[PDB]
Amino acid sequence: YGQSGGEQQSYSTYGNPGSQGYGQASQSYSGYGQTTDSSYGQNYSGYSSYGQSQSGYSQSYGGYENQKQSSYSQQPYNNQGQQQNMESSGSQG
Amino acid sequence: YGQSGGEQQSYSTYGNPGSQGYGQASQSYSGYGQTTDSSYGQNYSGYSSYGQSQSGYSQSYGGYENQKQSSYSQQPYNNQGQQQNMESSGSQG
Amino acid sequence: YGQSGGEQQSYSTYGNPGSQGYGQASQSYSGYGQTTDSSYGQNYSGYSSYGQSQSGYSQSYGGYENQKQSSYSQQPYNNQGQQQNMESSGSQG
Amino acid sequence: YGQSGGEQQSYSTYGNPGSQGYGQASQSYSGYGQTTDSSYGQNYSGYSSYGQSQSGYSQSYGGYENQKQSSYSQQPYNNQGQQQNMESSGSQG
Amino acid sequence: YGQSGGEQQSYSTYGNPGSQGYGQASQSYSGYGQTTDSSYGQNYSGYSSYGQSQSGYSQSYGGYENQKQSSYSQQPYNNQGQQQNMESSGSQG
């Protein structure tokens, strides 16, 4: 068995991800068929090439700017980061 | 058995990830078929090439700027980081 | 058995990761089939090449700047780092 | 058995990681099939090449700058680092 | 048995890691199949080559600068480091 308290998870991405998977992907083979000279796939996100395919994938991006001041800025304030606060959330027999 | 308190997890990325997987990927073979001269795949994120495929994947990015001042800045304040605060969250028999 | 208090985990990346996996990937073979002259894969993130594939993956990035002042800055303040604070979170029989 | 207090973990990376794995990867073989002249893989992040594949992976990056002043800076203040503070978090019978 | 107080762990990297693993990787063989003229792998991060693959991985980076002033700086202040503070966190019978 196992007993755990509450759970907080936080994810932040500042940038261009090529692909993102968040959910559940399942691929199961419980049968007893024949796969011969073949290929099969599950592509949840991103890029899969199989069979006798001929393909190409290009992703091109310009620049990325985050919390940026161009010339002649007067006392800019830029704040970022992660803060975790936990109280009274230990374990007790 | 196992007993744990609360849990906080925080993730931050400042930049361009080629691929991100966050969720659950499962691939199971419980059957008893034949795989002969074949290939199969689960691609959750990112890039998979199999079968007799001929493929290519290019990702190209410009620059990245974070908490940046161009010329002639007067007393800019740039703050980042991680702070963890925990109180009264130990274990007790 | 095992008893633990609260848990805080914090991750920060300032830069371009080629691939990131955050979640759960499981690959199981509980069956009793034949795999002959074959290949199979689970690709959670990043790059997998198998079968008889011919492929290529290129990632190209420009520069990276973090907490940066161009010329003629007057008393810039740049702060980063990690701070952990723990109180009254030990163990007690 | 084992009893522990609270736990704080903090990770920071200033730079371009080729691949990052954060979560759980499991690969299990509990069956009794035959793998002959074959290969199989789990790729959680990063790069796996097997089967009869022919592949290549290139990652190219420009420069990296962190807490940087270009020419003619007046009394810049750059601060980074790690600080751990612990109070009253020992063990007691 | 074992009793421990609170635990703080802090990791910082200023530079480009080729690969990073943070989480749990498990590879188990509890079955009783035959692996003949074969290879299999778990790649959590970084680079694995097996099977009859032909592959290459290149990572190329420019320079790295941290807490740097270009020419003509007036009284720059650069601070980094690690500080650990512990009070009243010993053991007691």
Author numbering:
A (entry chain I), B (entry chain G), C (entry chain A), D (entry chain E), E (entry chain C): 7 to 99
What does the paper say about this structure?
In healthy cells, FET proteins are mainly localized in the nucleus and undergo nucleocytoplasmic shuttling. FET proteins have roles in transcription and in the splicing, processing and transport of RNA. Surprisingly, we found abundant amyloid filaments of the FUS homologue TATA-binding protein-associated factor 15 (TAF15, also known as TATA-binding protein-associated factor 2N) rather than of FUS itself. The formation of TAF15 amyloid filaments with a characteristic fold in FTLD establishes TAF15 proteinopathy in neurodegenerative disease.
We used cryo-EM to image amyloid filaments in the insoluble extracts from each individual. TMEM106B filaments were not observed in individual 1. Contrary to our initial expectation, the filaments are formed from TAF15 and not FUS. The TAF15 filaments comprise a single protofilament with a left-handed helical twist, with the ordered filament fold formed by residues 7–99 of TAF15, which are part of its LCD. Perpendicular to the helical axis, the shape of the filament fold somewhat resembles a scooter, with the proximal N and C termini representing the two handlebars. The filament fold contains 13 β-strands of between two and eight residues in length, which encompass 57% of all residues. These β-strands, together with their counterparts in adjacent TAF15 molecules, form parallel, in-register β-sheets characteristic of amyloid filaments. The side-chains of the four acidic residues in the fold face the solvent and one of these, E71, forms a salt bridge with the only basic residue, K74. Consistent with a protein fold stabilized by intricate hydrogen-bonding networks, the high-resolution map shows that the TAF15 filament fold is well hydrated. We modelled 23 ordered water molecules per TAF15 molecule, each contributing between two and four hydrogen bonds with either polar amino acid side-chains, the backbone or other ordered solvent molecules.
